[PDB]
């Protein structure tokens, strides 16, 4: 599965969402170069205006593109599940607000790495930070904690995202994630470790559709 990521791999992302009954779709295209832990993607809201802030969707919108140091290669669950793929489920709890529940499949379709996602958001406040579009268009760096989930033959991941608001407060988004293989082939169950992630958000000055350009670098690390 690691051999599939030695070069530049095209990526396709499709999200079908519904948040407090607001339906929307997002499509994304770009490419990933896992040797450098690098992702380059452009996402479009194909249904018109996106009803939630772009930053709230970043985690949902392919951890197989992380750079795993040579010394940690035995801990790369994400690549090991390929090409058959993995199921990625989350609940994201927005503090003092609603939650997203997502289910995605990440796998190859021919040469393309595809991330197909369904998202449902419930219990959001209609003039809160999410539905009221009060989050800054930026993104902090942080560490993602990966643990084996031996019983489920997969991993559990927990992490908190802090979305900056212009008063100097943050909107917390607490993530609980599970990943399981689609195939029944062998996978790598890791020891506890983390992914250091950084994300830069931007706009295409020639793009009239509601969109997000995203550049991300991710490198694993482990404590000895």
Author numbering: 4 to 64, 68 to 226, 228 to 231
Sentences from the paper on this structure:
EGFP is an archetypical autofluorescent protein in terms of structure and function. It comprises a core β-barrel capped at each end. Running through the centre of the barrel is a kinked helix that houses the distinctive p-hydroxybenzylidene-imidazolinone (HBI) chromophore. HBI forms as a result of covalent rearrangement of three residues resident in the central helix (Thr65-Tyr67-Gly68).
